[PDB]
Tab-separated table of C-alpha atoms in Angstrom:
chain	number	residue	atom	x	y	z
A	24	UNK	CA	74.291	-0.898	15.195
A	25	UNK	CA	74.245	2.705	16.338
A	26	UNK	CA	76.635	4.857	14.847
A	27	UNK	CA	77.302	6.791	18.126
A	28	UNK	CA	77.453	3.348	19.497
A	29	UNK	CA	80.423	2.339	17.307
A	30	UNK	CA	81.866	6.324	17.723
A	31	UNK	CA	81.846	5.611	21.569
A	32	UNK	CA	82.977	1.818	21.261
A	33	UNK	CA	85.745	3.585	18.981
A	34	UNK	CA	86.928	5.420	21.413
A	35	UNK	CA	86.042	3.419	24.062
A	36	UNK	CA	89.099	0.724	23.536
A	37	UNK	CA	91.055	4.658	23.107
């Protein structure tokens, strides 16, 4: 679980 990957996947269903 990369953090960017989650920051990106956050803001990725935004």
């Amino acid at each position: 679980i990369n953090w960017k990957g989650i920051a990106a996947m956050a803001k990725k269903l935004l």
